[PDB]
Amino acid sequence: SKHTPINLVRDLPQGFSALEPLVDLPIGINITRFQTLLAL
Amino acid sequence: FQPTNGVGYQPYRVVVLSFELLHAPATVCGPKKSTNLVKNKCVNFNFNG
Ligand SMILES: *[C@@H]1O[C@H](CO)[C@@H](O)[C@H](O)[C@H]1NC(C)=O
Ligand SMILES: *[C@@H]1O[C@H](CO)[C@@H](O)[C@H](O)[C@H]1NC(C)=O
């Protein structure tokens, strides 16, 4: 993951930024589908 | 039963902690006890494996 302040909205920001590792859980399961969550 | 039951009749607590090795993650270590760190000398080092 990485966090960075940007200015563009409808388009992804211009520039380069590496992402650092944050979590390395050994879940030891296999995943074939995913979904996001939202707050209303 | 009695609080001073003899062997073979008194309650027997058992724990069956089981060692398992499968597709589940294998977080297995060894009997490595920490030792002092020396410097400025030719030594055999083992940092995290
Ligand atoms: C992924 O699916 C495979 C074979 O299709 C199955 O063997 C396995 O149970 C799944 N992997 C995990 C870590 O659950
Ligand atoms: C909260 O902000 C956004 C605006 O669309 C949305 O979740 C909702 O319409 C707003 N009002 C709520 C959650 O009560």
Side-chain angles (χ1 to χ4, degrees), chain A residues 26-28, chain B residues 25 27:
Chain A
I27 190 167
Chain B
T27 73

Side-chain angles (χ1 to χ4, degrees), chain A residues 27-32, chain B residues 24:
Chain A
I27 190 167
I29 77 176
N30 152 35
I31 295 166
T32 52

Side-chain angles (χ1 to χ4, degrees), chain A residues 1 20-28, chain B residues 25 27:
Chain A
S1 161
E20 295 90 336
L22 261 67
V23 178
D24 307 70
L25 324 172
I27 190 167
Chain B
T27 73

Side-chain angles (χ1 to χ4, degrees), chain B residues 2-19 24-31 34-37:
Chain B
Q2 290 86 22
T4 176
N5 276 128
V7 183
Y9 192 49
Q10 61 190 354
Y12 200 100
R13 290 189 179 168
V14 187
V15 165
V16 199
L17 285 151
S18 317
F19 300 168
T27 73
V28 63
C29 309
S34 275
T35 66
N36 211 348
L37 182 137

